[PDB]
């Protein structure tokens, strides 16, 4: 398993314009297109970022494209990030799948804002930080990805996803 195959489980793959979770227009793997409530808006967004005509619908190389390009961006972000960096690099490669995870997720920003579980985390305090990290809109607006991702933390393991 890595980062790769577990993104692809938890975001599914979808070859047509549709709404996530949240209700935003998305496509592919977990690619985001606008939190505009206009579908034009989001076919226009689409086309942009595949710089051709798509009339909301793309093919699966160029899902696989958009999906390598937000991994790196992803990962990037984390590694520019003041407050991301010094977790990232005191953990194993597991749990760096599992902060990869969460950024793709809900960003840089929304991840920053988890301040006492990161401290947790930096601290290998992997029981306590699974608690923490429960206690939140993510976990409760979607239990069984949240569910995996800590069981990820918490045991270091791809055990969740197998
Ligand atoms: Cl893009
Ligand atoms: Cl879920």
Not at 58 to 73: G, H, R, S, W, Y
Not at 78 to 101: E, F, G, Q, T, W
Not at 112 to 135: C, I, Y
Request: hydrophobic residues 40%.
């Amino acid at each position: 398993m890595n980062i790769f195959e577990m993104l692809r489980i938890d975001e599914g793959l979808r070859l047509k314009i549709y709404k996530d979770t949240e209700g935003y227009y998305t496509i592919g793997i977990g690619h985001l297109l606008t939190k505009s409530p206009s579908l034009n808006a989001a076919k226009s967004e689409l086309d942009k970022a595949i710089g051709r005509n798509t009339n909301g619908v793309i093919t699966k190389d160029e899902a696989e494209k958009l999906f390598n390009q937000d991994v790196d961006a992803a990962v990037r972000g984390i590694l520019r990030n003041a407050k991301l960096k010094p977790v990232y690099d005191s953990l194993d490669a597991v749990r760096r799948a599992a902060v990869i995870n969460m950024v793709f997720q809900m960003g840089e920003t929304g991840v920053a804002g988890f301040t006492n579980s990161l401290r947790m985390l930096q601290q290998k305090r992997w029981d306590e930080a699974a608690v923490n990290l429960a206690k939140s809109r993510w976990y409760n607006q979607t239990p069984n990805r949240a569910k995996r991702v800590i069981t990820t933390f918490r045991t270091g393991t791809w055990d969740a996803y197998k």
